[PDB]
Amino acid sequence: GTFIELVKNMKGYKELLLPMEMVPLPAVVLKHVKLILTSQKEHQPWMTEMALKADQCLIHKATLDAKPLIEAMQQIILAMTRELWGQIQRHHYGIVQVEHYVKQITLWQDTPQAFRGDQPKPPSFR
Amino acid sequence: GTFIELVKNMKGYKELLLPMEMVPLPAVVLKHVKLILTSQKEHQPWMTEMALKADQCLIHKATLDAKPLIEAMQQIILAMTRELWGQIQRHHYGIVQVEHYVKQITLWQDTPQAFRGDQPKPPSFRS
Amino acid sequence: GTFIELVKNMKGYKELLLPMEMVPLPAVVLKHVKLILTSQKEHQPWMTEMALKADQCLIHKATLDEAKPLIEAMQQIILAMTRELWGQIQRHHYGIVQVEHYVKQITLWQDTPQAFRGDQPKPPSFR
Amino acid sequence: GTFIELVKNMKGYKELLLPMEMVPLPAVVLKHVKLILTSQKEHQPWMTEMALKADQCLIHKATLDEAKPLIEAMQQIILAMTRELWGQIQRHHYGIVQVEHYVKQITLWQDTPQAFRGDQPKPPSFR
Amino acid sequence: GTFIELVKNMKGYKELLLPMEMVPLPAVVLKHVKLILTSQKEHQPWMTEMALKADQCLIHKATLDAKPLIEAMQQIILAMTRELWGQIQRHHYGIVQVEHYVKQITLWQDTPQAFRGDQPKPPSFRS
Amino acid sequence: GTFIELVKNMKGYKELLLPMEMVPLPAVVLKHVKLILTSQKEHQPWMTEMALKADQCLIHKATLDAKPLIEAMQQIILAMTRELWGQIQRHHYGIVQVEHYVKQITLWQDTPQAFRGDQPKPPSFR
């Protein structure tokens, strides 16, 4: 995964992916995909990326129907699901709000529990 | 493939992926990713998207190092390269030029081989 | 800390050391050093000193990762550096006045008996 | 020095490290720390960081004053700190531009063969 | 090759050297050097650089007139011609045009042979 | 080496290479290459020439690990080192200053020792 490491060291880079624990489960994340694609018109390039991304999860899920080999796919599904959910948040809240929101989550989850305070408020559907 | 099928059944859709017979090998495609990512400044959102797909492809290749599982994964890798390779040409030529170039190949490929003629050349690089 | 004693009498002096229990583990502290450096667009002399200070911790981690007195001595140096590094991160993220003002409230809040503490003080907003 | 690599590409960056042979022994370096602090009348944030940095050396001196790898490791940390402390002393006494400008002349002067070096470069005036 | 590797890992880098499979033979390349150098006026700094490389290549060829030594030198000569030949095209076509022409060959060469198509032509000569 | 002779007979040509004796030793000359390339940004065409030139010396140096054949490489290393050092001087002092400085060196080194006087002052880092 050296490719992402190079980007993470670049100038003006802000992470847009939530921690694995905070990411929803599969399937339920896919439900939001239909609520966006089916409810959208005037196709745009980003809509194809999500479709070409969501369908990969289904193929991996269908593969459930070597165990170390199988374990790799399960991690991949979570990785793709984490990436896929980021676009869903990017679509609802835009891009700027997600940048600030993700930054606060890290601080609240990094400081010791004795001084965290309260979980930061997620952004609004503006 | 239902999700991609829905997108194709839309208005304003423009396919940007070349036929599988023209995409380079996975190793070659990853080579261009490093050159583009390494020689870039002022990180842009699309750069992260390209990197994430490259990371996913690497994991599958490492996993290769159960026949339905093995055979199915190979198809995913080929699809991943096609999606990633088509995104590279957007950076080199441009999305507008890619549409015509992909469209030209389709008519050229669909035309009978007897009178097919010379293959059209790729567009000019983005300035 | 004889040098520190030479700074207490100075007019504009402040105690730039958060409680030892407040700071997280060294690994997490270094993680936020990259984010502040990566996010920053321009350059100031302070970040260069910050970058060098963090680098020393990694060598100490690698170096640490009859000898008990020295092995224990290395840990104390690493922890002390983390507090100083963690102080800069907090002050930059929130502000010098807010951190010092916040520290006094929480420091007194813990001292007050639990039967009358009430609620914990206001955590500074990221601004 | 991965963090340092993140600062080289920055526009306003300079190499703030004099040659190891140029700096004196640690004891002499700490001696001039008091003079700059004692002479100074007002307070700025930089001296507070300088005071803390010097204090760490004294603990290392006391701490240093199968164990060979760690004992040798402590010496390297002390020497590296002295260069950074010695750099600040020189820049403050003479100036940032003069020190960097002077370093290049002397660095090249030594490289030139003795048969054609001539005379040593100009030592910066105390101003 | 560390030094060249460092340059490739920079921003604004543009490779100007063709693949070794396309460079002419060393004798042919030296032929163009004489024509350019002989038919020139108002000596320019780049002219000296081209001449010096040509002189170095000649010495190696004369030296040919120990297998690791002999084999290693032949690789140097081929590299020398590639570096020298790439510099000739800068004078004929131009640096800007060379970048695209070299870039076009890379995509053309990387594209699968089945659908590779006609080889792109060189740019127009500098006026 | 007839190629350089043709250039040396051209109009408006000024030598920028110091005598062999005044040129530093190898390796130490290479140290300045790193201090320039590693400290440089916004790659420029000349930076590639130095890299493609310095690396040749390393290959020749590695060859140390037929003696008339070997002697040829040693002379080549000095020749390349002399050429490589000229670029280093050209980078620090520019081009105009080096032209004048090299000219004075020749006069001081050509006149008899009874009338040389003092070695000319090398230029400054302007």
Closest C-alpha among E92, E102, E84, E95 to residue E124: E92
Is A102 strand, coil or helix?
A: helix
Q: Is C48 helix (H, G, I), strand (E, B) or coil?
A: helix
Contacts 24+ apart (CB under 8 A), E113-118: E114/B21, E114/B22, E115/B21, E115/B22, E115/B119, E117/B118, E117/B119, E117/B121, E118/B118, E118/B119, E118/B121
Q: Do E93 and E8 form a contact (C-beta atoms < 8 A)?
A: no
Question: Taking CA atoms, what residue in F is nearest to D5?
Answer: F38
Torsion sign across C-alpha atoms E119, E28, E2, E93: negative
Residue B55's nearest CA partner among E10, A49, A58, A83 is A83
Task: List the alpha helices (DSSP H) in chain E.
Answer: 2-8, 26-38, 45-64, 67-92, 95-110
Distances (CA, A) of F73 to B124, C22, F3, F53, F60: 46, 65, 20, 15, 7
Residue A8 CB burial class (10 angstroms; 0-12, 13-18, ≥19): middle
Q: Specify the residue for token string 């001449």.
A: E51
Checking chain B for breaks where C and the next N are over 2.5 Å apart, the residues before them are: 65
- Is there an interface between A and F (3+ Cβ pairs < 8 A)? no
Q: What angle do CA F45, A8, D6 make, to 5 degrees?
A: 55
Q: Which residue is it, tokens 């293959």?
A: B119
Burial class (CB in 10 A: 0-12, 13-18, 19+), A80: buried
Nearest CA to F79 out of F12, F7, F14, F17 is that of F17
Residue F18: how many CB atoms within 10 A of its CB?
Answer: 19
A13: nearest Cα among F61, B42, D36: B42
Structure tokens at B66: 């159960």
**Residue found under tokens 């060829």:** E61
Sequence length of chain B is 127
CA distance A29 to F64: 64
- Interface of chain F toward chain E, CB-CB under 8 angstroms: 1, 3-4, 6-7, 10-13, 16, 33-34, 37-38, 41-45, 47-52, 54-56, 58-59, 63, 66, 69-70, 72-73, 76, 79-80, 83, 95
Of the candidates E16, E59, E76, the beta carbon closest to that of F59 is on E76
DSSP per-residue letters across A30-79: HHHHHHHHTT--S--HHHHHHHHHHHHHHHHHHTT--HHHHHHHHHHHHH
Cβ-Cβ contacts under 8 Å between B and E: the total is 35
What is the SS3 assignment for B43? coil
Interface mutation vs chain A, best among B46, B48, B57, B84, most A CBs within 10 Å? B48
Residue type, C10: M
How is F8-71 classified by DSSP, letter by letter?
HTSTT-------TTTS--TTHHHHHHHHHHTT--S--HHHHHHHHHHHHHHHHHHTT--HHHHH
Q: CA of D65, closest CA in chain F: separation in Å? A: 36
**Nearest partner of F48 among E90, D12, A7, E93, judged by Cα:** E90
B117 Cα to chain A: minimum distance (Å): 32
Helix C68-93 and helix C96-111: axis angle, to 10°?
Answer: 120
Instruction: Report whether F48 contacts F17 (CB < 8 A).
Output: no
Shortest distance, CA B70 to any CA of chain E (angstroms)? 25
Two structure tokens written together for C32: 């936020």
Q: Using alpha carbons, list the distances in angstroms from residue E82 to A14, E26, E89.
A: 42, 9, 11
Nearest to B44 by CA among D103, F91, A7, A57: A7
